[PDB]
Scaffold this active site. Structure first.
Site, PDB file in Angstrom:
ATOM      1  N   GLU A 142       0.841  -1.173   0.000  1.00  0.00           N
ATOM      2  CA  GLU A 142       0.000   0.000   0.000  1.00  0.00           C
ATOM      3  C   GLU A 142       0.877   1.224   0.000  1.00  0.00           C
ATOM      4  O   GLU A 142       0.425   2.212  -0.619  1.00  0.00           O
ATOM      5  CB  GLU A 142      -1.102   0.026   1.076  1.00  0.00           C
ATOM      6  N   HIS A 185      -0.934  -1.476  -3.019  1.00  0.00           N
ATOM      7  CA  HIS A 185      -2.359  -1.379  -2.718  1.00  0.00           C
ATOM      8  C   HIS A 185      -2.974  -0.180  -3.443  1.00  0.00           C
ATOM      9  O   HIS A 185      -3.947  -0.348  -4.178  1.00  0.00           O
ATOM     10  CB  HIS A 185      -2.613  -1.370  -1.206  1.00  0.00           C
ATOM     11  N   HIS A 201      -5.980   0.428  -6.616  1.00  0.00           N
ATOM     12  CA  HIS A 201      -7.223   1.181  -6.547  1.00  0.00           C
ATOM     13  C   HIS A 201      -7.398   2.045  -7.799  1.00  0.00           C
ATOM     14  O   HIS A 201      -8.518   2.169  -8.299  1.00  0.00           O
ATOM     15  CB  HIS A 201      -7.304   2.002  -5.253  1.00  0.00           C
ATOM     16  N   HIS A 215      -8.899  -6.459  -1.950  1.00  0.00           N
ATOM     17  CA  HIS A 215      -8.475  -6.420  -0.555  1.00  0.00           C
ATOM     18  C   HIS A 215      -8.326  -7.834  -0.006  1.00  0.00           C
ATOM     19  O   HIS A 215      -7.585  -8.037   0.959  1.00  0.00           O
ATOM     20  CB  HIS A 215      -9.382  -5.521   0.294  1.00  0.00           C
TER      21      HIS A 215
END
Ligand code: CU
Ligand code: CU
Lengths: 307, 341
Positions: A7, A22, A26, A62
């Protein structure tokens, strides 16, 4: 460490090598419709933290990320019988009771609530503008835990309460390897135990996982979402409690003022974050004296109750 | 001396046997120098081509290393330095020419070899030798367009040049116009960049750059030239900068990279060239061709696409890490100075 790496927080010990995994995910997922900007379109819902959870793909992405973390957790050494035993303490039973409902039974339903969206409605004639939200809600309940001291001194302990599904698709007791990953934390609080016998009672609204209604509507998980929905015919679930030795778990410095430390030395998801020790196979033989299991049944009712 | 000028005659008419006479000279070749196909009637030849020659160059019979490897490549085959096997063949021939340390012995070795090995290969091997020996230095090598026009010109002209040369007397010959913008029509927007991609000039510059700075040879010498790594980066980097400029001047956007090798290649290209040495044409590539695993047993290529992908994955890692690892296992740091090189 791994969290900061995955992330990518500036705390990552090497952003350049391990990337911004991460977050970049997105963006990729939110721009499938226009990735080179030729259509002058903005990002879909997965591109904003405010809205990301609305999309089903959120849970897939996730879910993947979690598997990567798991890959580390399964390398850690199993918690030894010793490590999760509390010498002297024994939990002999846990139950739940709701007003006007059998023991060991949770109820859910729909409930309308009202919110004033007036401050947000630009260039709209001033006044009040109440909106009616329909959302899952659970009947209030309370845990009742029977703990024996058998030491001769006041013992401090952490009460750790999780809940998972009971059975598999074939209708048997779920195995630990599977079930450990489906345990949802329900509460974690400090308790003082007198010598001999102790009857601990804890309300659903005292949960340290949750924050009150008033905070959300007028950071914390919404109170009305504390209990899974369950089925109309009833959904079987294993309620689990553990009392750990607070002296080891203590950290000398929703849960008072937030700005200093995480108040538990144990790993997050502590009873079930690691693999089982040899011989253990299902929850009912993972247990130590200072733990207890209880069959709960979660009943939904498709009705709209008022507040 | 003359010897320097006599080697330049080897570049003349690469596929005409060396006994046919180059310019206003001709070579007086031994019979053990004659090729196996022509040697059994050889005498009838020396006489037949003796005419119209001012000078006769003598050639002494010398030892001659084994030319097995140089001769392994077919005469009617193509030659590329990218193909692993050809590299070993050329590097071996270069080694022979390089190894004759007097200008007279070089002339003898050359004259013998010339009609036994692949013309394209010969040209390369000689070019490299002459350019990097001490006795043959600062010698002006004939342009490779003039020796191998097939790599620089639409195949259509060749049958016009043959017609013109046979029908019309010298002096009255019309210049042959070379077609431009001939590889694709206006349906392909790429055709606009003909004046850059297909320009004689820039193709010669590229060929020559790789002559003076090869990546494979023998020892460090003639490969280990100052900052050749950075040179390789920069030169090629400027090609694309200039290309991207020319793109903008033809109402096109910047060239898109080959992200990943599994996705089809949108832009096909039929080059319209015919190799007179191979006697075939270069194959074209169709629109939306896909890269495929190679298994060219003959050429000594057994490479999978995943191999390429693996190399890339590793190189990226090193670049981000900031250092590479040598054969020994030690780490070398990609610093501000020598990193790029
Ligand atoms: Cu996220
Ligand atoms: Cu190049």
């Amino acid at each position: 460490i791994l969290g900061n790496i995955i992330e990518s927080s500036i705390l990552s010990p090497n952003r350049q090598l391990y990337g911004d995994m991460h977050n970049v995910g997105h963006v990729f997922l939110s721009y499938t419709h226009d990735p080179d900007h030729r259509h002058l379109e903005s990002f879909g819902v997965m591109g904003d933290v405010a809205t990301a959870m609305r999309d089903p793909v959120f849970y897939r992405w996730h879910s993947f990320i979690d598997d990567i973390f798991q890959e580390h957790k399964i390398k850690l050494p199993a918690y030894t019988k010793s490590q999760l035993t509390y010498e002297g303490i024994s939990v002999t039973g846990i139950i739940v009771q709701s007003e006007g409902a059998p023991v060991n039974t949770l109820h859910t339903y729909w409930q309308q609530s009202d919110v004033d969206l007036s401050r947000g409605m630009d260039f709209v004639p001033r006044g009040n503008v109440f909106a009616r939200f329909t959302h899952l809600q659970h009947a209030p309940f309370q845990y009742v835990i029977q703990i024996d001291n058998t030491s001769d001194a006041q013992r401090m302990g952490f009460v750790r309460i999780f809940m998972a599904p009971k059975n598999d698709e074939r209708g048997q007791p779920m195995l630990f390897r599977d079930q450990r990953l489906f345990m949802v934390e329900m509460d974690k609080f400090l308790v003082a135990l007198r010598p001999g016998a102790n009857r601990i009672r804890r309300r659903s609204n005292e949960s340290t996982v949750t924050i009150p209604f008033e905070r959300t509507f007028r950071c914390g998980w919404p109170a009305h979402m504390l209990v899974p929905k369950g089925l109309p015919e009833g959904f079987p679930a294993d309620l689990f409690v553990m009392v750990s030795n607070y002296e080891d778990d203590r950290v000398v410095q929703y849960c008072g003022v937030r700005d200093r430390l995480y108040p538990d030395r144990k790993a997050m998801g502590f009873p079930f974050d690691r693999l089982a020790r040899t011989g253990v196979d299902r929850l009912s033989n993972f247990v130590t004296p200072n733990m207890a299991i209880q069959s709960v049944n979660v009943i939904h009712i498709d009705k709209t109750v008022p507040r | 001396m003359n010897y320097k000028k006599n080697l330049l005659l080897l570049y003349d008419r690469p596929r005409e046997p060396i006994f046919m006479g180059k310019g206003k000279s001709v070579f007086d070749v031994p019979d053990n120098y004659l090729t196996d196909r022509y040697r059994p009637i050889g005498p009838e030849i020396q006489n037949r081509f003796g005419e119209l020659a001012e000078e006769r160059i003598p050639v002494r019979s010398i030892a001659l290393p084994d030319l097995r490897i140089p001769m392994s490549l077919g005469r009617q085959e193509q030659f590329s330095l990218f193909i692993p096997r050809h590299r070993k063949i050329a590097a071996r021939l270069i080694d022979i020419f390089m190894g004759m340390r007097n200008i007279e012995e070089l002339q003898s070795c050359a004259v013998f070899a010339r009609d036994r090995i692949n013309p394209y290969l010969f040209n390369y091997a000689l070019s490299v030798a002459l350019l990097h020996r001490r006795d043959t230095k600062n010698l002006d090598l004939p342009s490779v367009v003039e020796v191998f026009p097939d790599k620089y010109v639409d195949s259509r002209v060749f049958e016009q040049i043959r017609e013109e040369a046979t029908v019309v007397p010298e002096g009255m010959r019309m210049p042959i116009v070379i077609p431009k913008d001939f590889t694709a029509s206006d349906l392909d927007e790429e055709h606009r960049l003909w004046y850059f991609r297909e320009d004689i000039g820039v193709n010669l510059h590229h060929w020559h750059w790789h002559l003076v700075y090869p990546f494979e040879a023998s020892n460090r010498a003639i490969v280990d030239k100052d900052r050749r790594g950075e040179l390789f980066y920069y030169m090629h980097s400027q090609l694309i900068a200039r290309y991207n400029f020319e793109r903008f001047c033809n109402r096109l956007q910047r060239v898109k990279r080959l992200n990943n090798l599994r996705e089809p290649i949108a832009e096909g290209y039929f080059p319209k060239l015919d190799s007179l040495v191979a006697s075939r044409t270069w194959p074209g590539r169709v629109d939306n061709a896909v890269i495929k695993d190679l298994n060219r047993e003959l050429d000594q290529i057994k490479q999978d696409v995943s191999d390429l992908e693996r190399w890339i994955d590793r190189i990226y890692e090193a670049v981000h890490q900031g250092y590479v690892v040598d054969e020994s296992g030690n780490r070398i740091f990609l610093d501000e100075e020598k990193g790029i090189d």
